[PDB]
Write a protein that binds this DNA or RNA. Structure first.
Length: 231
DNA sequence: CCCGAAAGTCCG
DNA sequence: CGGACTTTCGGG
């Protein structure tokens, strides 16, 4: 069965505008885990828009199919475009898509794709369906997969006053001993971000609970100004 | 335009 | 370790 014509068109149009000179540093930035065509976001967005203008966005029945086919292509711009396309189908995504999103997280995994999936798509789903959090978050934490662990930390990133504090700190407690950079840094990020909403609770937490040095330092990057640095 | 964020390198 | 610096991206 041939590639979806929308995907084939996107592949042709991206490839015709590839930049091997840019592709080298772009690939190095992601520690050479991926091939790149060398197309940065402003142009990549326009090239996608070109193809939508010519062909129209595919019927929603093909949404998941399009994403998977782009995910399977070698160059990283196709996963970036896949996430752009998923946003265009946003109003069709619901709690039944959690396993689909899980599978995107653990395939072709790196911080660029995982950070674009978790606080937005999964964040929105669990905001509307908080009773489903316990069907997934314990498995993610227990898994061997650091990107599922990062997902458990960051899905509440944008919740602000809707943050479940007890849950957030429980998740962090489960992962605070991890030696993995992407876990330590995610803990620092979500604490730094939540401190914009409730600085007192984040300050108390980091002064009274064990965290990796990186995690603590990132968490209080800003709020240390409000409390001071004791001699 | 600005700022803050993922990262990233380089240095002591 | 952690500070200083860098580019790219998203959002005032």
């Amino acid at each position: 069965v041939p590639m979806h014509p929308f995907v084939k068109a996107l592949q042709e149009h991206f490839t015709a505008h590839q930049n091997p000179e840019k592709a080298e540093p772009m690939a190095r930035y992601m520690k050479n885990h991926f091939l790149f065509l060398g197309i940065q976001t402003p142009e990549r967005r326009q090239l996608l828009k070109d193809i939508i203008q010519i062909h129209t966005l595919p019927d929603q029945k093909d949404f998941q199919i399009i994403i998977r086919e782009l995910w399977d292509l070698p160059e990283r711009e196709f996963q970036a475009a896949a996430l752009d396309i998923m946003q265009k189908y946003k109003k069709h995504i619901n709690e039944t898509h959690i396993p689909f999103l899980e599978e995107l997280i653990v395939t072709k995994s790196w911080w660029d794709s995982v950070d674009s999936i978790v606080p937005t798509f999964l964040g929105d789903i669990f905001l509307k369906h908080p009773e489903l959090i316990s069907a997934y978050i314990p498995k993610w934490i227990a898994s061997d997969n650091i990107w599922l662990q990062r997902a458990a930390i960051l899905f509440q990133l944008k919740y602000k006053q809707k943050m479940d504090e007890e849950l957030l700190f429980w998740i962090i407690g489960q992962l605070h001993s991890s030696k993995e950079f992407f876990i330590q840094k995610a803990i620092g990020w979500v604490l730094r971000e939540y401190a914009k909403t409730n600085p007192d609770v984040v300050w108390e937490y980091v002064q009274n609970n064990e965290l990796a040095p990186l995690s603590k330092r990132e968490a209080i990057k800003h709020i240390k100004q409000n409390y001071g640095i004791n001699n």
